[PDB]
Symmetry: C3
């Protein structure tokens, strides 16, 4: 078929993202597989998605991914990525409009509350059933048979490590094997008179790991002023393979945030409570799940003992953010996060007071092209040697194009 | 050039195929590199072909292939294919319409009678000359200089193995080296009054291997009943590198099939005779060549001693098939195959009676999109321990889109 | 977005090139990593370039590369390239027309005078600033932070080797490490009354290697006759890491060529002088840089001691070329090159008189599609055993499509 013709049944979207990241560390800082260790690297992430109508009620979707690094520093003057595109997602979508339901089967980015829903979200193979028969309500069941785990490295539960006690790869949350994942979801979006309300309810059973359960709600509204409030609880109870190890513990997390917009000024205040002093627990499956609206900073929740994807210790944190937006074009702003981790100091690492300040610029050049930067300073009250404390700077420049 | 413009000299076609295969085996079953060993794997095979008019009388062709597997079972919950596209075919086509002839040079899927002509057909580099000056007759010469062997694994002659005698990789047909391939073909398609007649004659010399020669003919009829009859002989005589090894033997194969269609019922009866009791011989070069219309079942001709691409043993098999077709849309049907292999029990394995039954569903959703499934049960009268017999089940679900 | 739409902001170009090369050698020939050692190989090089307008003043560019080989001979009857596309260039271009300047940042083919500017040109990551404010003058500064070195193999300075003294990998120019590259360029194109004048001036500092400096000028003109004259000097002075090794030496090269066109006849005469009798020096960074207009033959400047990208020995060569062009369509022509290398015979290899004759056909089938061939015979007055001399033939057939 003439390509001119073939492309008419096709839709394209994607992402092009560049990153110049440099992360530094005091010798006393508790480093691990999740903190930013870039050394003036140029990083590329490109994704191109094609969706094609292939028959009545059937679309096919593919995503191509380019994930590559070029060096700057030292011997990295020869590191220059010679890489190709990889098929990252490949799946079929049956849609029946009469019953406002879709079946999506294949290798797909999961986009559940316990995984990143953006560029680097966990991908697996399985089936998703999604219903929109009710006004303002999305109902879904899903089953995953396998996970694209290698690509995710230390983003995935059970694949994070940390430094300490003369070993670079102490396992943050040992997971000897994994099963299939089964779950469901209800996700509401409603116009009250006052404004929009977004409740969410998530259940899943990950065989050999845990039964997860979560609720999250957001209210948002007008008056020229805008304010949102958002809360969430995520908990899980362990499967018996972990329960019998004795050194794991059912997860709990509480988080709340409120925020304000007026005249270009924006600000937010929020906090959260999670983990267990003595035993390993997790909040999410991959990275920080879909909880970004209930977080702040960049690095602080990657410190040892404070990671949301497996770690040991009890965490309390509060944060504030603020920024001004010149002409709806450039935003200068900052984040401040403060809190701590409690551990059993005899057996586990990362306990103590922690803080982070972040300065930010976000420049909206066009509706599709943004440039952004941040400077993050993180301080640990007690480092490798717990008597002294420890610094960790991270600087990023970023270009990001969406299409 | 604007891409909009550039694509006007371009033509696209391809394939998307999904497969959920699970193959199981009695501990007593004779396993080898060709039987189905899938363990609830999701298998993707995608091909996209672009053909561009580059100048007067010249087209260029490329094919991109994605061949990947995702796990289901056990430790395969982490196996999830992180693969890219590979250039599978790249060739030039000179066409002169005045002499109804085309010259096709490059890396190309061979599509000769001794290779699979479908998705997973053997690819090599060489030249093809094809003529359509005579009404209803296609004439061709061809020469191949190299073969895309690795991709084919055990589908290729000389690269199959089998289990037995405490060794997992007993070579089915040892081929220490290979030469170039040269051959020709005549392929007729004629409307007699009664109906269509399709004679074929194929010759080739594969240096260091064998001289192949084949004839195949099919008659089919029109209108409310329909019937086809199809026969074939494939033989080869060995090159002296194999003749002097003493343990090889010129190949012969005879096959015949007849079949009936009426009111949605269809049925077929057929049989075949091939191989040699004492010595290794082959029928085809890759997999089961283009002989699918003269076969039945799924697994039976992959049992040790019965493979069409190198094996020792003499084979006689008969088969019957049957099915009903609700609305020209869904076909439920079955295959029964029965026969045996005769060997020298002292020196070689796989001798004995063999059967296979297969249940089938074939659902034509659209002209481009088909879903199919099958359940195959294969029985070996004499297994690893030849005293007891042995089972082998295999189940497949399949989606297949052509464009 | 509908793809139909998305492709309107896009521009495509590229190259498809096929090569059947076979290079042979006397047992007495001095072989190395740069002479042609093909054995009836089919070679493919494809590049496809997409440039997209992404916002006001911003384009993005990507290049995909396919670089692959299929065998012919012996065991190479199984070598058949199973390769994919790789992202070879990925870069952003900011263009401000008000100041006739462009900033091009990313992974890009450098196209400086010291690298190949064609299909296989050295790629690195960095920034290029280019100005066209002056009539007939292009001004540029550039900085490179890393190099795509692996892809270039022995084309890159410091990665060539040679055979001799019972060792196959004697290093032609040992470079233990490399720094960043910084340079600038001025490139003129002017219509004098007589005809066009093309001066060029190139400076760069490659940290840990050398400071390079170059001038090149070309005059061309009418009188139905056409004649060009072109000269160049390339020199470099070493960085102290090489100066202190004592066995390296600042590079100098002089070259001059004049040439004639009339009635389909064309001819050229030229010569050059480079290198150092006792010590390793280089002229260019990758392959033969952009100096092809000042060279002739195919193989002779790849002989040991005569390579433009790192070698020991002093070289003088002269050459003549000539050809006739039937109908602006087919050119039959030849090259003759003659000269020598002076070395310290005690310590280094490749010294002696050398010649090359090349017969050529170049068939312009369309403005986009060319077929070409050459036969090259190279003779070394003194080979491995320096008493006897040594032959090296090289034959190429080539198809080359540009779009
Ligand atoms: C083009 C691919 C379409 C089919 C992919 C099917 C994946 C099925 O997942 C089933 C979930 O199994 C849980 C056990
Ligand atoms: C000895 O030669 C055996 C046959 O070789 C035919 C080779 O054809 C190569 C054509 O490749 C063209 C790719 O564009
Ligand atoms: Ca991730
Ligand atoms: Ca599974
Ligand atoms: Ca195959
Ligand atoms: Ca060959
Ligand atoms: Ca090169
Ligand atoms: Ca650098």
């Amino acid at each position: 078929t003439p390509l001119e013709e073939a492309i008419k049944d096709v839709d394209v979207s994607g992402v092009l993202r560049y990153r110049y990241d440099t992360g530094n560390f005091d010798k006393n800082f508790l480093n691990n597989s999740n903190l930013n260790n870039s050394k003036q690297d140029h990083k590329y992430r490109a994704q191109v998605n094609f969706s094609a109508a292939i028959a009545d009620n059937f679309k096919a979707f593919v995503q191509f991914d380019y994930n590559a690094v070029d060096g700057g520093t030292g011997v990295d003057n020869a590191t220059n990525a010679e890489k190709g595109l990889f098929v990252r997602q490949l799946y079929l979508t049956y849609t029946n409009e009469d019953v406002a339901t879709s079946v999506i089967a294949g290798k797909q980015q999961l986009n559940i509350i316990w995984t990143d829903n953006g560029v680097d979200g966990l991908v697996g193979t399985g089936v998703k059933v999604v219903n929109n028969s009710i006004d303002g309500l999305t109902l879904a069941a899903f089953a995953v048979d396998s996970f694209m785990a290698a690509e995710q490295g230390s983003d995935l539960l059970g694949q994070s490590t940390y430094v300490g006690n003369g070993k670079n790869n102490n396992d943050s949350f040992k997971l000897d094997s994994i099963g299939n994942l089964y779950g469901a979801a209800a996700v509401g979006s409603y116009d009250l008179a006052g404004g929009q309300f977004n409740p969410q309810l998530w259940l899943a059973y990950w065989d050999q790991v845990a039964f997860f359960y979560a609720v999250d709600a957001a209210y948002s509204t007008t008056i020229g002023i805008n304010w949102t409030l958002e809360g969430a609880y995520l908990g899980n109870s362990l499967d018996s393979e972990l329960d019998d190890k004795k050194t794991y513990a059912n997860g709990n997390l509480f988080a709340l945030k409120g925020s304000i917009e007026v005249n270009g000024w924006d600000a937010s205040l929020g906090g959260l409570y999670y983990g267990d002093k003595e035993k390993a627990s997790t909040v999410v499956i991959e990275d920080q799940g879909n909880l970004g609206s209930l977080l702040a900073g960049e690095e602080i929740f990657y410190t040892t003992g404070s990671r949301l994807n497996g770690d040991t210790g009890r965490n309390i944190f509060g944060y504030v953010t603020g920024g001004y937006t010149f002409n709806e074009t450039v935003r200068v702003g900052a984040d401040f996060v403060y809190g701590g981790t409690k551990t059993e100091a005899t057996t586990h690492l990362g306990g103590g007071k922690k803080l982070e300040a972040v300065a930010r610029v976000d420049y909206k050049y066009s509706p599709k092209l943004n440039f952004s930067a941040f400077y993050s300073y993180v301080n640990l009250d007690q480092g490798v040697n717990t008597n002294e404390s420890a610094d960790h700077s991270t600087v990023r420049l970023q270009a990001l194009y969406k299409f």
